[PDB]
Amino acid sequence: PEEEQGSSRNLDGRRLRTVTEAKALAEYLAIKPEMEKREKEARRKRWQEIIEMTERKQEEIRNGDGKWVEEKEVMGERTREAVMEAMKAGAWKDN
């Protein structure tokens, strides 16, 4: 209702919108320095984290699959089985 009648006046001749804006500017002056600090170290921490991601990717490049590794294991066991059957059947033909 005060928002509806913001251009009306109090008993001391003051507009209700000016009472509201004075209260809002009081709140803004109370809150402004700490939120300035909050956004300051927010910027600091955020692009510090961006930096840290960049050197972690740099270290990943600096130091540089499943079907691959079980294919290697299965051919190793198959080659071993070939070795045992070869000297079980007597396949000595080396030179």
């Binding site: 809002a24 500017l25 709140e27 803004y28 809150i31």
Partner: peptide, 27 residues
């Protein structure tokens, strides 16, 4: 250009041409 403009006039389609945060303290 005159011939093309007459072609566009003849083939004009009216349906195709039809359709055409912050806080109170911060304020």
């Amino acid at each position: 250009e005159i011939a093309r403009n007459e072609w566009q006039r003849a083939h004009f389609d009216p349906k195709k041409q039809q359709v055409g945060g912050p806080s109170a303290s911060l304020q």
